[PDB]
Amino acid sequence: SSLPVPYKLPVSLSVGSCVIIKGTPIHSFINDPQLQVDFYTDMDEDSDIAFHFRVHFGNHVVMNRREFGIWMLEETTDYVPFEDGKQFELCIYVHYNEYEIKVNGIRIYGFVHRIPPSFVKMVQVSRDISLTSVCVCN
């Protein structure tokens, strides 16, 4: 891994920002690896989460948010166009009303803001990936 995992990256996000995550799953899909990305409101792991994104490779993606310490209503999609054993590029684009999630250039979901994305102060990338690079662009 080029970067340690869990990878906790302090960030400042605004409308127009893009978080770009490149990495590779560390297990084959028959071993049910996962990838997780959390848009935290503070460096503290127990702080509120504006956008939680957990991929079960080869299966589905679960998304949620944590508000006042409470997990809210989970959202899911079965559209997970990651390839077994290959490097992926995950782009999370901050729009005025949602996070647009793209996997290998393919839009898979739009997760609507319930708090402003400018409240996000740390992005944590975790679980079963080797992390090649993480960029925040505008």
Author numbering: 2 to 139
From the paper:
To test this hypothesis, we mutated Arg53 in Gal-13 to a histidine to assess whether we could restore lactose binding. Using the same conditions, however, we were unable to crystallize the R53H variant and had to use a different solution containing PEG 3350. However, we did not find lactose bound in the Gal-13 R53H mutant, even when the crystallization buffer contains 50 mM lactose. Nevertheless, the R53H variant does trap a molecule of glycerol at that site, and that trapped glycerol molecule is not observed when we flash cool a crystal of the R53H mutant in the absence of the glycerol cryoprotectant. Moreover, the C2, C3, O2, and O3 atoms of these two glycerol conformations occupy the same positions, whereas the C1 and O1 atoms are oriented differently. In one instance, the C1-O1 bond is oriented towards the conserved tryptophan (Trp72), and in the other, this bond is oriented towards Arg55. In this regard, the conformations of the two glycerol molecules in the R53H variant are different from those in Gal-3 and Gal-8.
Galectin-13 (Gal-13, a.k.a. placental protein 13 or PP13) was first isolated from human placenta, and its gene has been mapped to chromosome 19q13.1, which is in close proximity to the galectin-4, -7, -10 and 1412 genes. As with all other galectins, Gal-13 adopts the typical “jelly-roll” fold formed by sandwiching two anti-parallel β-sheets that consist of six (S1-S6) and five (F1-F5) β-strands and a short α-helix connecting strands S2 and F5. Gal-13 crystallizes as a dimer with its subunit interface formed by the last five C-terminal residues (Val135, Cys136, Val137, Cys138, and Asn139) that are located within the F1 β-strand. We found that Gal-13 forms a homodimer structure that is stabilized primarily by the presence of two disulfide bonds, unlike the structures of other prototype galectins.
